[PDB]
Amino acid sequence: KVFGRCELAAAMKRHGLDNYRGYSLGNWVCAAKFESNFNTQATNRNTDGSTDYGILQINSRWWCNDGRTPGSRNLCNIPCSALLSSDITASVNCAKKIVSDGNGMNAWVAWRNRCKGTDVQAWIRGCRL
Ligand SMILES: [Cl-]
Ligand SMILES: [Cl-]
Ligand SMILES: [Pt+2]
Ligand SMILES: [Pt+2]
């Protein structure tokens, strides 16, 4: 599913990503935009034989398992395909653990390069929340 910008923001709000670990909702919307372009089915492989999954591009080296990646630990205790669903609950839950893992949102490359330090408030404009 391809989300609308405020549509995704509403869902993220409900699951409480707004201001989670000190990151305002706009950060999380911006992250999703530049990681997956609001597409829950987005998948991208990188050169360590692993794939980033879903709306927030969670990597299978540590967080989820595809049976495809070496030395995978699956710290979110969930198949990587659960992060592909139209329902973002699986991704948000796992994301909360990731952002708490001693790096904040720096775990997400696209966020660090295209969202961090910017007026993230813009990503929730026009939204009724
Ligand atoms: Cl919850
Ligand atoms: Cl809305
Ligand atoms: Pt809306
Ligand atoms: Pt939730």
UniProtKB/Swiss-Prot annotation:
List the cysteine pairs that form cystine: C6-C127, C30-C115, C64-C80, C76-C94
Known EC number? 3.2.1.17
Instruction: Tell me if Transmembrane is a UniProt keyword of this record.
Output: no
One annotated GO molecular function: identical protein binding
Query: Mind listing the UniProt keywords for this protein, alphabetically?
Result: Allergen, Antimicrobial, Bacteriolytic enzyme, Disulfide bond, Glycosidase, Hydrolase, Secreted, Signal
Natural source organism: Gallus gallus
Q: What else is known?
A: Lysozyme C is capable of both hydrolysis and transglycosylation; it also shows a slight esterase activity. It acts rapidly on both peptide-substituted and unsubstituted peptidoglycan, and slowly on chitin oligosaccharides.
Active site at E35, D52
What protein family is recorded?
Belongs to the glycosyl hydrolase 22 family.
Tissue and organ expression note: In the egg white and polymorphonuclear leukocytes.
Quaternary structure (record): Monomer.
Where, per UniProt, does this protein localize? Secreted
Q: Which GO terms describe its cellular component?
A: cytoplasm; endoplasmic reticulum; extracellular space
Name of the top EC class for this enzyme: hydrolase
Listed under catalytic activity are: Hydrolysis of (1->4)-beta-linkages between N-acetylmuramic acid and N-acetyl-D-glucosamine residues in a peptidoglycan and between N-acetyl-D-glucosamine residues in chitodextrins
Name the UniProt record assigns to this protein: Lysozyme C
Q: What is its main location?
A: secreted
PANTHER family from the UniProt entry: LYSOZYME C (PTHR11407:SF28)
Give a Pfam family name: Lys
Q: Tell me, which GO biological process terms does this entry list?
A: cell wall macromolecule catabolic process; defense response to bacterium; defense response to Gram-negative bacterium; defense response to Gram-positive bacterium; killing of cells of another organism
Tell me the ranges covered by the C-type lysozyme domain, including all copies.
1-129
Q: PROSITE patterns annotated for this entry?
A: GLYCOSYL_HYDROL_F22_1, GLYCOSYL_HYDROL_F22_2
> SUPFAM superfamilies from the xrefs?
Lysozyme-like
Q: What does this protein do?
A: Lysozymes have primarily a bacteriolytic function; those in tissues and body fluids are associated with the monocyte-macrophage system and enhance the activity of immunoagents. Has bacteriolytic activity against M.luteus.
